[PDB]
Amino acid sequence: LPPGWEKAMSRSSGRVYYFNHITNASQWERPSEPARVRCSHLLVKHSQSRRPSSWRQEKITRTKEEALELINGYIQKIKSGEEDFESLASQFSDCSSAKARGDLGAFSRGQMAKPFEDASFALRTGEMSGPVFTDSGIHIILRTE
Numbered sequence: 001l002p003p004g005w006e007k008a009m010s011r012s013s014g015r016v017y018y019f020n021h022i023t024n025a026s027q028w029e030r031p032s033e034p035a036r037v038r039c040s041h042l043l044v045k046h047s048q049s050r051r052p053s054s055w056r057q058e059k060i061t062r063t064k065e066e067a068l069e070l071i072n073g074y075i076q077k078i079k080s081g082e083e084d085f086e087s088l089a090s091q092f093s094d095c096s097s098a099k100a101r102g103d104l105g106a107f108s109r110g111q112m113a114k115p116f117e118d119a120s121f122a123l124r125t126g127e128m129s130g131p132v133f134t135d136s137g138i139h140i141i142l143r144t145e
């Protein structure tokens, strides 16, 4: 199995799914490296985020736990089709890339914080990460190219 994928078993179901420790993604189907990628993301800052401040809110005061409850709620809407990544990124992302629908443009290794970079490079085109953690907050990353 490819970059950082692993067999896991469902607690509710008893069915084998697959989990990516690098991207924190999980899917049911058995999964199937480039020089540059392009990613969008939705960032939710928390009180130990680097700059606890954003265009949404001048002091960010939510805790690491509450940030992850948000990221998990957003992930549910996105995965359920009830809203899409872009619309949620524009509305809710604490990153100023919110206005470009979360788009960060194309990049290569060396450019971005490493947790984010590894997740970016381990995603497949069109694939969405689970929650990924950097000193900035907790990201949901969507690899577009």
Ligand SMILES: O=C(N[C@H](Cc1nc2ccccc2[nH]1)C(=O)O)c1cc2ccccc2s1
Binding pocket: 043, 051, 094, 095, 096, 097, 103, 104, 112, 113, 116, 134, 136
């Ligand atoms: O790194 C940035 N600044 C942070 C948010 C952030 N933190 C990151 C950590 C890793 C990768 C991208 C990231 N973006 C902020 O706005 O507080 C960027 C802002 C913008 C705005 C427009 C285009 C690219 C970028 S990259």
